C-alpha cells in the first residue's frame, strides 16, 4: 500500500518507500553485459564488480533516458531485487530531469503502465522535489549530480522552463579530473577499484576554497592543507591542493577545457531570466541539492559569488541541507506520503482511457 | 445511486432525481396539524385540502427556514412519500436562500447527516443554480418566488454577498393583491379553493404591461384587454385591468403600501454595488428565475426599465427561460449530475470528523 519512490540519476539510482527518511536502495545506474552477446545481464553493484568481463552501459545521460531497454532492466531490478516488491501492487513516483522531452515523459508512462502494470503513477521534476524537501514552494535549485548540473527557478511549486540552465559538467567530470591530476603526481588509477578510490578521495578529502588564489599559495608555502590518504593496500598517499582544485572546476569550467560559465554565474543568469517581482525570493531561497554540492565550503563560496553579482541591497541566502545527497529522493518520499497527494496520481483507469499523453494534462 | 435534488421554496417544494429534466414532485411547503393538538400531521397537498380543520404552517419564511421541526416533517415526507426512497441511500443536494445565516446552514447539515443519515450532502444558493441552468458562471439573477425576491450578482460561479438585494414582495403578495381588487369588484374569494382560483387567475390571465399608463387607458376606452374566466362552478367572470395591475406591484411596490424600490431599480442598485470591470457582463446576463417572473411581458418590461437606468452605451440582455418556474431545481439537477461534481459532496466521514461547520469550509 506504500507508494514506491525511484529517483533515476545518471550515476546512482535512489529507491525506497514513500514516508521513509531515506532511500532503502542506492546503487549505480548501470547495466552490464558480456562484451559481444547483445547471466545475460547484470545491474548495479554486481555489474560494477564484474567490470573486467562486461560492457557497462548508462541508460541515463545527463539526466535524460537514452536507452529504454536498459532503463527497463534497471527498473525491473529495482522493484524485484532491490525493493523486493511487485510494482503492480504499488503507486510509483518516478523523477525526471528538468527540460525532459514530452516523448520521454510519455515513454516512461507507457512502460510503467503497460510493462510493470503499475496501479498509479506520477513523474516529478528532480529539482522541484529538492525544493519541497527544504519545505518551500518558491526558490531556485542548483542540482549538481553525477551527469548533469541544472539551475531550476521555481515559483509557487512550478519550475520556470524558460529560465532553466543546464551545465554539462558534474561529479563524473570531477572524478575524472582528480584522477588526471593525481595521475600526473606519479600515482596510478585506471582500474575500477582504483577509480573508486579516486571517487572516495573526492568525496572525503575535496573541498571548495573560499578564495581559490589565496588558498593555492597557502599550499605553496605550507603543508597545512595536505591530507594523507590510506589506500586499501595499506600504502598511504598525500593529496595536496588537488583537494580544492578539483571542485573549483564547478566555478571555472575552463579547468577542464570547458568553455562555459561556472555554477555561480549560471545561477545569476537563471534568476535574471525570471520576472523581477520573483527575483528577490529566488535570491533568498537558493537551494543546493545533489552529491556534487556536498563539497565542504561550497555554500559559503556560492554566498560570496552570488553576493558579488546580485544588487548590493539584495538578501542572498544559500540553503545546503546536510542530507542533500538524497534531497531529490526525500522530496519524492514527502510528496507521495501527503494526504493531499492522493488525488494527484495518474490511475491505470485514466491511462487506459486517455493513453500516455495524459502525463502532461495530469501535471497537477 | 442517483443523487436527490430538493429545492425548498417558501411556497413550493420541488423535488426529484439529479439528471432528470424536471422535478418529479412539486407540492406546497406546508405542515398541517389539528388546531390544538400540538393523523397527528399532514404535509403538502393533503394539508391543503384539509384546510378547514387544520392549522397550516410554513416552515420557510422569505426563503429562510424558521421552524426546524416542521422542516424535518417536510423533508421526511419528501423522501419517503414523494420520492419514495430512503435518504441514507442517496447523496442529497439541498438549496438555500441567498444570505442564509451560517447557523441555518449548519443546522440543515446536522439534520441531513444525523437525522436522515445521508451518505453525501451539498447546499447550493438558489440563484446560483438558476444561473447554471442558463449555462453561465457569470450573471445577475432576479429570483422572484412565493415568499421572497432576490437580486443576486454572480461572478465566475460565486455570488457577491455585499451586492445581494432582498425585496420582501413576491407571488404570495401578488395573489393577495389580486384577491383584494377582485373582491372589490364584487366577487368573493375567501375559502382555500377560492384563493386557489385567484392564484389560477393570476398565473393564467395576468401579464406585465410594457407601458402601464398607456395600458391602463386602453382598458378605460376599450374591452380589448378583458378576458373571461370560467369558474369551477361553471359561472363565468370578467377580469379586466387587474390583469396587468397585479404584477405591476413588482415595479411599483407602492401599490401594496410597500415603501421599496421595484425589481428594475433593485437590479440596477445591485449591479452598482459590484466592481466596474464586472458590471458590463452583469448587464449582459440578467437571468430571470422563479414562478413570479413567469408573467408574460416581464422580460420586455425589464429590458426597457434597465435600459433607461444603464449607461446609453450598455448592452442590456434579459434571459427568461420558458422553464424558469423550475430553473433552481434544474440547476441543481445539472450540477449534481456532473462528473466534475462528484468530489464536491460533503461525505458522512467528513461530517463525522469535522462536524456541521464543514459546510462553510467545503463550499467548493
Amino acid at each position: 500500500t506504500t507508494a514506491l519512490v525511484c529517483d533515476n540519476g545518471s550515476g546512482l539510482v535512489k529507491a525506497g518507500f514513500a514516508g521513509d527518511d531515506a532511500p532503502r536502495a542506492v546503487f549505480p545506474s548501470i547495466v552490464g553485459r558480456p562484451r559481444h552477446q547483445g547471466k545475460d545481464s547484470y545491474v548495479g553493484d554486481e555489474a560494477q564488480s564484474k567490470r573486467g568481463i562486461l560492457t557497462l552501459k548508462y541508460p541515463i545521460e545527463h539526466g535524460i533516458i537514452t536507452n529504454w531497454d536498459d532503463m527497463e532492466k534497471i527498473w525491473h531490478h529495482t522493484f524485484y531485487n532491490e525493493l523486493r516488491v511487485a510494482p503492480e501492487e504499488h503507486p510509483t513516483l518516478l523523477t525526471e530531469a528538468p527540460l525532459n522531452p514530452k516523448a520521454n515523459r510519455e515513454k516512461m508512462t507507457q512502460i510503467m503502465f503497460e510493462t510493470f502494470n503499475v496501479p498509479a503513477m506520477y513523474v516529478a521534476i528532480q529539482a522541484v522535489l529538492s525544493l519541497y524537501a527544504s519545505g518551500r514552494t518558491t526558490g531556485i535549485v542548483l542540482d549538481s549530480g553525477d551527469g548533469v548540473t541544472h539551475n531550476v527557478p521555481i515559483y509557487e511549486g512550478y519550475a520556470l522552463p524558460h529560465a532553466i540552465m543546464r551545465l554539462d559538467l558534474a561529479g563524473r567530470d570531477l572524478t575524472d579530473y582528480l584522477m588526471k591530476i593525481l595521475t600526473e603526481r606519479g600515482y596510478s588509477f585506471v582500474t575500477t577499484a582504483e577509480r573508486e578510490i579516486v571517487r572516495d578521495i573526492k568525496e572525503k578529502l575535496c573541498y571548495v576554497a573560499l578564495d581559490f588564489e589565496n588558498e593555492m599559495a597557502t599550499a605553496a608555502s605550507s603543508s597545512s592543507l595536505e591530507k594523507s590518504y590510506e589506500l586499501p593496500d595499506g600504502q598511504v598517499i598525500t593529496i595536496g591542493n588537488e583537494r580544492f582544485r578539483c571542485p573549483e572546476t564547478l566555478f571555472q569550467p575552463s579547468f577542464i577545457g570547458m568553455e562555459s560559465a561556472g555554477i555561480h554565474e549560471t545561477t545569476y543568469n537563471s534568476i535574471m531570466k525570471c520576472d523581477i517581482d520573483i527575483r528577490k525570493d529566488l535570491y533568498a531561497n537558493n537551494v543546493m541539492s545533489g552529491g556534487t554540492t556536498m563539497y565542504p565550503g561550497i555554500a559559503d563560496r556560492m554566498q560570496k559569488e552570488i553576493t558579488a553579482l546580485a544588487p548590493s541591497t539584495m538578501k542572498i541566502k544559500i540553503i545546503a541541507p546536510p542530507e542533500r545527497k538524497y534531497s531529490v529522493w526525500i522530496g519524492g518520499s514527502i510528496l507521495a506520503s501527503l494526504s493531499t497527494f492522493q488525488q494527484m496520481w495518474i490511475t491505470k483507469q485514466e491511462y487506459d482511457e486517455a493513453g500516455p499523453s495524459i502525463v502532461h494534462r495530469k501535471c497537477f | 445511486t442517483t443523487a436527490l435534488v430538493c429545492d425548498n421554496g417558501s411556497g413550493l417544494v420541488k423535488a426529484g432525481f439529479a439528471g432528470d429534466d424536471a422535478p418529479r414532485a412539486v407540492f406546497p411547503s406546508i405542515v398541517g396539524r389539528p388546531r390544538h393538538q400540538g393523523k397527528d400531521s399532514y404535509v403538502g397537498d393533503e394539508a391543503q385540502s384539509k384546510r378547514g380543520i387544520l392549522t397550516l404552517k410554513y416552515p420557510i419564511e422569505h426563503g429562510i427556514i424558521t421552524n426546524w421541526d416542521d422542516m424535518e416533517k417536510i423533508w421526511h415526507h419528501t423522501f419517503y412519500n414523494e420520492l419514495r426512497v430512503a435518504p441514507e441511500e442517496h447523496p442529497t443536494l439541498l438549496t438555500e436562500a441567498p444570505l442564509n445565516p451560517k447557523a441555518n446552514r449548519e443546522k440543515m447539515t446536522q439534520i441531513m447527516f444525523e437525522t436522515f443519515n445521508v451518505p453525501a450532502m451539498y447546499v447550493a444558493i438558489q440563484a446560483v443554480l438558476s444561473l447554471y441552468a442558463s449555462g453561465r458562471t457569470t450573471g445577475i439573477v432576479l429570483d422572484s418566488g412565493d415568499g421572497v425576491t432576490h437580486n443576486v450578482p454572480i461572478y465566475e460561479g460565486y455570488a457577491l454577498p455585499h451586492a445581494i438585494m432582498r425585496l420582501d414582495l413576491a407571488g404570495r403578495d401578488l395573489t393577495d393583491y389580486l384577491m383584494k381588487i377582485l373582491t372589490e369588484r364584487g366577487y368573493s374569494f375567501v375559502t382555500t379553493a377560492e384563493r386557489e382560483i385567484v392564484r389560477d387567475i393570476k398565473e393564467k390571465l395576468c401579464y406585465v404591461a410594457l407601458d402601464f399608463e398607456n395600458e391602463m387607458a386602453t382598458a378605460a376606452s376599450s374591452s380589448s384587454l378583458e378576458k373571461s374566466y370560467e369558474l369551477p362552478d361553471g359561472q363565468v367572470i370578467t377580469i379586466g385591468n387587474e390583469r396587468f395591475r397585479c404584477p405591476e406591484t413588482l415595479f411599483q411596490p407602492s401599490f401594496i403600501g410597500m415603501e421599496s424600490a421595484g425589481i428594475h431599480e433593485t437590479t440596477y442598485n445591485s449591479i452598482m454595488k459590484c466592481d466596474i470591470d464586472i458590471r458590463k457582463d452583469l448587464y449582459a446576463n440578467n437571468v430571470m428565475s422563479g414562478g413570479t417572473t413567469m408573467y408574460p411581458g416581464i422580460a420586455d418590461r425589464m429590458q426597457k426599465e434597465i435600459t433607461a437606468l444603464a449607461p446609453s452605451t450598455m448592452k442590456i440582455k434579459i434571459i427568461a427561460p420558458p422553464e424558469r418556474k423550475y430553473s433552481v431545481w434544474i440547476g441543481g439537477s445539472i450540477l449534481a449530475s456532473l462528473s466534475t461534481f462528484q468530489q464536491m459532496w460533503i461525505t458522512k466521514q467528513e461530517y463525522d470528523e469535522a462536524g456541521p461547520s464543514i459546510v462553510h469550509r467545503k463550499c467548493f
Binding site: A22, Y132, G157, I330, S333, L335, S339 | -
Partner: peptide, 25 residues
C-alpha cells in the same frame, strides 16, 4: 471566505508545513 483552498494549494500548504518521515531500520 471560510473556504478551504484549491486541492493544489492544499498540497503547497502541506509541502510548506513539512512532514516527519520515518527513521530507516
Amino acid at each position: 471566505r471560510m473556504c478551504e483552498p484549491s486541492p493544489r494549494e492544499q498540497l503547497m500548504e502541506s509541502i510548506r508545513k513539512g512532514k516527519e518521515l520515518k527513521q530507516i531500520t
